[PDB]
Specification:
The structure is cut from a larger assembly and holds chains A (about 120 residues), B (about 55 residues), C (about 45 residues), D (about 110 residues) and E (about 120 residues). Chain A has about 120 residues and is an all-alpha fold. The termini of chain A are far apart. By secondary structure, chain B is mostly loops. Chain E has about 120 residues and is of the alpha+beta class. The radius of gyration of chain E is 15 Å and the shape is globular. Classes of the chains: A mainly alpha (about 120), B little secondary structure (about 55), C mainly alpha (about 45), D alpha+beta (about 110), E alpha+beta (about 120). Chains B and E meet through loops of B and strand 2 of E. The structure holds four RNA strands. Chain E: InterPro entries: Ribosomal_bL17, Ribosomal_bL17_CS, Ribosomal_bL17_sf. Chain E: It holds the Pfam family Ribosomal_L17. Chain E: Part of the 50S ribosomal subunit. Contacts protein L32. Chain E: Belongs to the bacterial ribosomal protein bL17 family.
Chain lengths: ~120, ~55, ~45, ~110, ~120
RNA sequence: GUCAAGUAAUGAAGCGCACAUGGUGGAUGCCUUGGCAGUCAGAGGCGAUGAAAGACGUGACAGCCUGCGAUAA
RNA sequence: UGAAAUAGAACCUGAAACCGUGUGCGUACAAGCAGUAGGAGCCUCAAUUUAUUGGGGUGACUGCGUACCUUUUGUAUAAU
RNA sequence: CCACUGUCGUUGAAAAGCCAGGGGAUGACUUGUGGAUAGGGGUGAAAGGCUAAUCAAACUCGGUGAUAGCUGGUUCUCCC
RNA sequence: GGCUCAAACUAGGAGCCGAAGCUGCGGAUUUGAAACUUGUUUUCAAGUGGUAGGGGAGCGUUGUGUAAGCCUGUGAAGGUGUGUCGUAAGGCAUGCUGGAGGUAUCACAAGAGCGAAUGCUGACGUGAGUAACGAUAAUGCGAGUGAAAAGCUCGCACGCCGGAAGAUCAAGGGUUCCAGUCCAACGUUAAUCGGGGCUGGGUGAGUCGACCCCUAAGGCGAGGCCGAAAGGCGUAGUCG
């Protein structure tokens, strides 16, 4: 029962090369270079999937810091004010209010400013 | 002596970016009306209104 | 320079030829072994 | 339409003919022939031979006015390679590739 | 460096170069129209014209001097017989170079060398 | 409109990626005239009446292979 | 002619390496395993009452990021 | 017929050469042809030299798929 | 970078940032726990980084039975895209290409899965259109032929060898010799030319050589001697 591996090898190698499309040079053409580029891409994606949550919080905090400083206090005093006023609004929503509706954020800072 | 890694096809083609073919300058002879290279006799021998054979 | 082969027909037929093979017991074993392999050239 | 001529088997490297092909690509039937007849490259005799055959095919088989023709497409491919051995010093041999090229020309209005 | 120097080398020894242009000058004097390489055509003006100039006046010394530099009694008689009294009134430029393309065997620039006045 | 200051867009000698379309190459798939392992039986020799292996010939037809041997496909 | 001729004799199928041609986008002030997470712009298809989404291509700009195997106490290793 | 010195050549024109010089050149000379000595054997004005570009034990086949506490490699996936 | 009543140091205080830690939400999974009870179901608790290595569950491939079945020229395998599904190996569907085969399900058996072994074979890259084109005796021009001539033929001239680079052989080779014809490959370029391809022709002996007669070294060697066998030696001779 001789088994020829050409057919299964072809679609196996093709599966890796299809996943390596858009890569430069040998990384999208030859399997030996493409297989470890696909693995490395998956490793970056797994780590960057944690770092994304880490990077957007930095973005929200900076946006909130700009908004609070435009009218009144800083971010460090803003978060303390929201915490003392029992305001649960997340930094994601706050940064969206600051960047897209400045009247509401002005009213939102006042509630934090009167609480300290 | 020799390379430590194969040149990429891209890098090989950037060296070929000055590889052009020379295009001759042509003219029309006044007498025969034939096309010929500038400052050269026409294939049948005419250059600047003059016969060579 | 002088190379190793330097052919000579009388010397070739006298050390490797058909009658030289057949004149010894082991030379006939050489011929039998060429024939068992089916070689088209028995002797030089 | 597009009238095609092929010159499969030209005994010359493709790299040497791609230079000649890059100067007649897109040119009119007349400018391309002047470029080819006054070129110093060997690949120009091969391109002109294939270009001229494409012109006759348009004039004869397709009944098309050659005065309005143009070199619509041209590309040089790699052909079959003849493999030879070249002796070097110290009893070493290399492989020599004698490359050939295919020349495809398409003329059209 | 090559500042202000004259002459050709043409990948030959000087003895070969001297003999080659002697042969060319004799060939140009016989047929009066030769086809040669353009660098050779231009240098032929410096060996062939001075022979025509010295044949403008005919004497044994001049006749013998030409044969020293030409070594062809057939062309020396022709040089002093017809080429002399044809360019008598012409102040140089006895031959013209006409470029005639490139050679097939090696793509060398070619040129015709023709004597002026019916060569 | 003229000037000043500020600031876009546009380029490609070549190159990258994707797609389309080819060339080269001969994988894969399908296929078999060829092999491999056996079962049940038979046989176990050929040769001085010249063997086994060959050489050279032999045809209407040039070569090789196959057959044949001057009675020579 | 043939059902078929990119079945035309190097002939069934015709993969990949490798080499061209065309189209779209990017690319000539910017430093590195060439990706990844974001992301403007552009181009192209399908709906939709008409730039609003969705699919595809490209990837300006930002963050992070020193191949794989083996062998090792320990390798981006300038160790195989 | 040799091979002392140097340059060149060192993917050579050449797996030992060319060039400029150099040594012997009636002799223990050189050379053609044929023959003899065969592997732990031969031959050696002796270098472990040479014995078919192979020599502190030739080459070919066989024992043989020698052995290798050594090095390399060892191919689909997920769960504990 | 820059920082001097700090952006340094000491002693305190309050905020905030900050990890794959903790929590929140969704989903999977191992083990144990109350039961329609073998994943029949709802949960709960504690877990789920991992080399060597141990344990468990599966995927795909070739072949056998299932199968004289089922599918297939209204298009099999294979190839190449796309969509979709699963934790994964992978499955399914379908556009094009292809043109004659494939195989559900469940068992069964393996030449059963490759990126590495300075692995093996073939093909093709990079270097790179780079080095080089093989004695520095040397070529120029005019005609001819030709699709095309620096290289072929003829001519004039030039140069080189001339104790050879000229002639006769032996060895070795074997048709390379001559003519006609062709230029794909071969010739380190071109080629109309060639020791290349193809087709014909060509080698004439009493005196040249071989054969022949004779022998050298050295072989073989009726009988003979010696030796487990194979064989070794040797006389007359017979070759050489």
């Amino acid at each position: 029962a001789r088994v020829k591996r050409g057919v299964q090898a072809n679609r196996r190698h093709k599966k890796i090369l299809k996943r390596a499309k858009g890569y430069y040079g040998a990384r999208s053409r030859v399997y030996r270079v493409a297989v470890q580029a696909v693995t490395k891409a998956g490793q970056y994606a797994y780590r960057d999937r944690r770092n994304k949550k880490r990077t957007f919080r930095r973005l929200w905090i900076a946006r909130i810091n700009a908004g609070a400083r435009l009218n009144g206090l800083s971010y460090s005093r803003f978060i303390n004010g929201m915490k003392k006023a029992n305001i649960t609004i997340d930094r994601r929503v706050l940064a969206d209010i600051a960047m897209h509706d400045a009247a509401t954020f002005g009213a939102l800072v006042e509630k934090a400013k009167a609480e300290l | 002596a020799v390379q430590k890694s194969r040149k990429s096809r891209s890098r090989r083609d950037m060296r070929r970016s000055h590889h052009h073919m020379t295009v001759a300058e042509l003219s029309v002879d006044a007498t025969t009306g034939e096309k010929h290279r500038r400052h050269h006799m026409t294939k049948d021998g005419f250059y600047r209104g003059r016969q060579l054979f | 320079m002088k190379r190793t082969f330097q052919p000579s027909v009388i010397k070739r037929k006298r050390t490797h030829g058909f009658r030289a093979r057949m004149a010894t017991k082991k030379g006939r074993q050489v011929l039998a072994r060429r024939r068992a392999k089916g070689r088209h050239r028995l002797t030089v | 339409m597009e009238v095609t001529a092929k010159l499969r088997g030209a005994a010359i490297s493709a790299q040497k003919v791609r230079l000649v092909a890059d100067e007649v690509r897109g040119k009119s039937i007349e400018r391309a022939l002047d470029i080819l007849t006054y070129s110093n490259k060997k690949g120009a005799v091969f391109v002109k031979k294939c270009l001229n055959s494409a012109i006759a095919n348009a004039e004869h088989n397709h009944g098309l006015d050659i005065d309005g023709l143009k070199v619509a497409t041209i590309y040089v491919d790699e052909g079959i390679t003849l493999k030879r051995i070249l002796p070097r010093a110290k009893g070493r041999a290399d492989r020599i590739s004698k490359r050939t090229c295919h020349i495809t020309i398409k003329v059209g209005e | 460096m090559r500042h202000r120097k004259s002459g050709v080398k043409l990948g030959r020894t000087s003895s070969h170069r001297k003999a080659m242009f002697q042969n060319m000058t004799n060939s140009l004097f016989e047929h009066e129209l030769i086809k040669t390489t353009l660098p050779k055509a231009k240098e032929l003006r410096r060996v062939a014209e001075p022979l025509i100039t010295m044949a403008k006046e005919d004497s044994v010394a001049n006749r013998r001097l030409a044969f020293s530099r030409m070594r062809s009694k057939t062309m020396v008689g022709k040089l002093f017989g017809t080429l002399g009294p044809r360019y008598q009134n012409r102040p140089g430029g006895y031959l013209r170079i006409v470029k005639c393309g490139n050679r097939d065997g090696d793509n060398a620039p070619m040129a015709y060398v023709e004597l002026v006045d019916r060569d």
